[PDB]
Paper text:
We purified and crystallized the RD protein in the presence of BeF 3 – and solved the corresponding structure to 2.80 Å. The asymmetric unit contains fourteen RD molecules, comprising four dimers (AB, CD, EF, and GH) and six monomers (I to N). However, the BeF 3 – molecule only binds to molecules A, B and E, among which molecules A and B form a homodimer. The AB homodimer superimposes very well with the RD domain structure within the VbrR-DNA complex (RMSD is 0.92 Å), and the dimer interface is composed of α4-β5-α5 from both protomers, both of which represent an active dimer conformation. The homodimer interaction surface is maintained mainly by four intermolecular salt bridges formed between residues Asp91, Asp96, Arg110 and Arg112 from each protomer, and all these residues are highly conserved among members of the OmpR/PhoB subfamily. The other three dimers (CD, EF, and GH) in the asymmetric unit also adopt an active conformation similar to that of AB, even without BeF 3 – binding, probably due to crystal packing or high protein concentration. The BeF 3 – molecule is noncovalently bound to the active site Asp51, where it occupies four coordination sites with residues Thr78, Lys100, Gln53, and Mg 2+. Mg 2+ forms five coordinates with BeF 3 –, residues Glu9, Asp10, and Gln53. Interestingly, six molecules (I to N) exist as monomers in the asymmetric unit. In particular, the residue Tyr97 adopting an inward-facing conformation in the active dimer changes to an outward-facing conformation in all the monomers.
Residue numbers in the entry: 2 to 117
Write the structure that this text describes.
Amino acid sequence: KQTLLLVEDDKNLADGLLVSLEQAGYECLHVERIADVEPQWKKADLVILDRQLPDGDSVQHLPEWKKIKDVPVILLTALVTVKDKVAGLDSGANDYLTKPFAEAELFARIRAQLRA
Ligand code: BEF
Ligand SMILES: [Mg+2]
């Protein structure tokens, strides 16, 4: 069994999301602030990361998050500009996928981050 962590302030988006991954045979964590990622970063084998929480930007903490544990990070945010893409990808994100998004593709990019 594999463990992912969902960092998302959008509840209802996280609502229908946290069920498909469970149907994919996972155990997940949900987080809606930046004051809740550090307690759970050491727990998941992959982080699905939303940028603008009510705390601020989550990419600013991403490097200091990444060196606690080299965890694959997938940035799922409504920041679609290429300037935002190069920001997260270089900050330590193994992938970057914008909103709106495909569940079958997000799962494929998760199935691609966990084969090593
Ligand atoms: F509000 Be998130 F970054 F999509
Ligand atoms: Mg958000």
